[PDB]
Design a protein around this ligand. Structure first.
Ligand code: MG
Ligand code: MG
Ligand code: MG
Ligand code: MG
Ligand code: MG
Ligand code: MG
Ligand code: MG
Ligand code: MG
Ligand code: MG
Ligand code: MG
Ligand code: MG
Ligand code: MG
Ligand code: MG
Ligand code: MG
Ligand code: MG
Ligand code: MG
Ligand code: MG
Ligand code: MG
Ligand code: MG
Ligand code: MG
Ligand code: MG
Ligand code: MG
Ligand code: MG
Ligand code: MG
Ligand code: MG
Ligand code: MG
Ligand code: MG
Ligand code: MG
Ligand code: MG
Ligand code: MG
Ligand code: MG
Ligand code: MG
Ligand code: MG
Ligand code: MG
Ligand code: MG
Ligand code: MG
Ligand code: MG
Ligand code: MG
Ligand code: MG
Ligand code: MG
Ligand code: MG
Ligand code: MG
Ligand code: MG
Ligand code: MG
Ligand code: MG
Ligand code: MG
Ligand code: MG
Ligand code: MG
Ligand code: MG
Ligand code: MG
Lengths: 75, 56
RNA sequence: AUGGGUCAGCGACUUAUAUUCAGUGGCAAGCUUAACCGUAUAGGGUAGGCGUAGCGAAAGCGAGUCUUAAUAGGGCGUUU
RNA sequence: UCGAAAGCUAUUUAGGUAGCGCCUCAUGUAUCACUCUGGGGGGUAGAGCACUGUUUCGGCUAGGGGGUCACUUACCAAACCGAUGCAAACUCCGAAUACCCAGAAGUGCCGAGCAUGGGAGACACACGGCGGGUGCUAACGUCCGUCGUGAAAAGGGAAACAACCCAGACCGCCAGCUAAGGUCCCAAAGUUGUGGUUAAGUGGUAAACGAUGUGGGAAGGCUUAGACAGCUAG
RNA sequence: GGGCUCAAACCACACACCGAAGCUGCGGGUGUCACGUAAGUGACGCGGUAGAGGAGCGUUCUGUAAGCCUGUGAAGGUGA
RNA sequence: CUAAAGAGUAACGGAGGAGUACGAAGGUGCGCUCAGACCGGUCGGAAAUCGGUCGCAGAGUAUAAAGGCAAAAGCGCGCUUGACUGCGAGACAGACACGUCGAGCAGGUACGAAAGUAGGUCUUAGUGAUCCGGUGGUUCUGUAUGGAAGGGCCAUCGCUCAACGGAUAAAAGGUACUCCGGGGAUAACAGGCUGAUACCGCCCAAGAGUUCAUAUCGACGGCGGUGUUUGGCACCUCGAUGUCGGCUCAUCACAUCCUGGGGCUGAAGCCGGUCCCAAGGGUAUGGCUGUUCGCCAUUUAAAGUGGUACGCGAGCUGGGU
RNA sequence: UGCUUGACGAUCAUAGAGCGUUGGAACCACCUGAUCCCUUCCCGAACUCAGAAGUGAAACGACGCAUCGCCGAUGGUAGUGUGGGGUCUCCCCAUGUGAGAGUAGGUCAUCGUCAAGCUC
């Protein structure tokens, strides 16, 4: 009837911020859903992990018809 | 230019980055005066720790 | 809160055997002996131990080797 | 000479221990901090009602309930409209800070950084400030975050007074200047100067509430066509 | 605490002074770096429990030592 | 959620879930878009199926919540097995052991005309180390030799080991007959802090009081004081601070029981009620009970209320404990 | 030279919605029919095919309009870093920063590539 339970913290969130150099494979965002969407050079994992497919610098952008926040890798 | 900065209050018990502001200007002890170039980077350290310093 | 009435005497990180790291020496691709022998701290004794090659569970192969269909990737190793 | 910890994780564990964190030493190696400028994400403070809940009025109106027993409404009420509030587990919004990254000057006491290795100690913390849970926004309570001090810090102030304020003691001096705090005597230093307030020893402990205490300010009503009070008479 | 009321209270402003192991002065010691292939100079340091690191004093015995000191007075004891 | 806009972050803090499911509910290609409302329509009604308009996600997503969802990640259909084997640059997370994501390469596939997509499911729970034993493979080893046994390697099975980093394959209690090492790290007494509670006082004043709020009371509410009861906390004491009650002896406070001085009275007098001032002195004896208390009897001017380690055991008692 | 139409983008409401006017030469849509390819868990509704008799009615495109929506200052306010203070459950001062709401107002988008027609 009472309380006292909780689950472990998942260490979600942004791992590389805007303007940071990235290598291919670098995890950029850990998230539950797609709070951020995969832009250019960015892949999507099973658990909606955003990861780098190319080397460059992280660029965060909001764009499109749905107002989705995008993660892209630019040169 | 160049500005005279003197440390007039003690550094004991201050915040770490305020101490690093006074230490980053070259000041070591109370009533010690340094001559630092009047630059934006030096001015930001003087402005952060203004209450510890006497600037003239 | 504890302990001591005071003095004098005594009273607690030792030793052996294995070992690692550091310092300081000997010799150096070698270094070192154990038991033992020895008119005996000498000298001999080099069986053994460590080093000079690694990888692999291992057979094994070997500056490579293991995994693997793969001489591709990757692991460990090799330029002291 | 340097110099902690009272944390995290695990534990038949909880006053033990172990890895990591924090100390020290050595070796190697090139980073680090402060600030400025630039690039970022956020969902907190605040705010708000767009969602989910919860409010209070009013209007309009289902539907429910009365009189008929086919018509009209005594009486409650969905929705909608307008006004109006609340919310840790609400958000159409949304800072400051903090955090991550890049470039740059100077300063680092000669180094900050990192790596490897030798040696630890420590894993009972406490108070104060700030942000919170809990408790009664009780406790010198309890549990977190964060900073400061004590621990492990003497000196000066707070009468005395770990944790508050100032300040970090290598040694000596019968030299000087200051900090907090002070300057009539105890007791070092103004019975200093200028302009006010208080009469309660308030100062030098407290609330709702009460009161012709007293100072200042801005307004208003009546008023030498007689104001207010007192006295006479109706 | 004494005592205090045109205050020795409160509010505002000003000029003085006191006040620490803080700062400065003078003398001394020590740590670390750098310059020194030197004596030394320069800069910055030098509160501290647990704990790490470094450098020493003293005591008994062995060697140095069949030496040296010692009855013209050793060790010990007690004063300066 | 707490959690203080990066991460993390405790409480016997506030709330909910899990110990599964699915060979399709996985892959792919193609196609589609919900809930709800209103109107019309046989049974049919609030609500079944049908048509139209609005609706624009208020639905759905196996399941709790949160975050997502149009290239829908929601729904249908055809074909399928990528819920593949070896791996794996690079990261996240992190004491370790574990954990998470993953481009790309090779082998072999599925769907599609193709570009492509596919190494399970919208995501985050659905789990258990080692040892031991079992099963399927194996070019490894095989105690003279050849075999074999046994061992190794790869795959896989057996724990509500749920106290879930799992002491053993295997385990409950009593002690007032007790004992040791410790702790004021931690309870009982007393002290302390606090003041919810307690007691005392005040504010407002509906009302009671024949009328009349305040003679006396005073609802609903509000503000304090004391330290004073029941408590909260765990700061002192566990290398020992003796307990309730009685006896003896006290000392202080005043929120006064009597005596003293007064104001108001619903004070005629006698007697009262209430409030202000006042702490000088005084302030029962018995029955019952260990009682403090209380009830009772009989007095008294009165038989006060508290603090003092609930005063007082190096002063007594020992009835209670 | 510019315009119109269509396809694909940039951007994602100041761009949307609603209302009204307008376009058929071409384009596009509605449209004709269903034997042929292909389709309906029924239905040529959609998908598909062969066309051009008819029409810009629907849709689409263009134009206009602040009714809704969306955007939105300035000033102030709230909060807040640092230092200090108070009567300290909460505030104030110095300095730095600074919303949300609301108000004034704004909006009936802007741009690019290609193809066809026309204009000049
Ligand atoms: Mg004793
Ligand atoms: Mg030090
Ligand atoms: Mg266990
Ligand atoms: Mg708020
Ligand atoms: Mg930076
Ligand atoms: Mg512990
Ligand atoms: Mg602890
Ligand atoms: Mg703590
Ligand atoms: Mg405490
Ligand atoms: Mg405590
Ligand atoms: Mg200690
Ligand atoms: Mg002091
Ligand atoms: Mg003193
Ligand atoms: Mg004097
Ligand atoms: Mg004077
Ligand atoms: Mg007073
Ligand atoms: Mg008159
Ligand atoms: Mg002076
Ligand atoms: Mg001095
Ligand atoms: Mg000094
Ligand atoms: Mg000197
Ligand atoms: Mg010092
Ligand atoms: Mg020292
Ligand atoms: Mg002797
Ligand atoms: Mg966070
Ligand atoms: Mg934060
Ligand atoms: Mg119907
Ligand atoms: Mg209906
Ligand atoms: Mg699904
Ligand atoms: Mg054999
Ligand atoms: Mg076998
Ligand atoms: Mg466990
Ligand atoms: Mg018995
Ligand atoms: Mg005992
Ligand atoms: Mg205690
Ligand atoms: Mg107690
Ligand atoms: Mg005590
Ligand atoms: Mg004792
Ligand atoms: Mg009295
Ligand atoms: Mg009396
Ligand atoms: Mg008298
Ligand atoms: Mg009696
Ligand atoms: Mg009797
Ligand atoms: Mg007593
Ligand atoms: Mg006694
Ligand atoms: Mg006795
Ligand atoms: Mg057709
Ligand atoms: Mg038309
Ligand atoms: Mg606005
Ligand atoms: Mg605004």
């Amino acid at each position: 009837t009472r309380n006292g339970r909780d689950s472990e913290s998942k260490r979600l969130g942004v791992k590389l911020f805007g303007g940071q150099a990235v290598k291919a494979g670098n995890i950029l965002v850990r998230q539950r859903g797609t709070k951020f969407h995969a832009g250019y050079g960015v892949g999507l994992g099973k658990d909606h992990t955003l990861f780098a497919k190319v080397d460059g610098v992280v660029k965060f952008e909001t764009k499109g018809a749905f107002g989705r926040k995008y993660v892209s890798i630019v040169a | 230019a160049t500005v005279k900065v003197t440390l007039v209050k003690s550094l004991n018990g201050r915040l770490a980055n305020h101490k690093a502001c006074v230490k980053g200007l070259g000041l070591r002890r109370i009533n010690h005066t340094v001559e630092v170039q009047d630059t934006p980077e030096n001015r930001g350290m003087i402005n952060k720790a203004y209450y510890l310093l006497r600037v003239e």
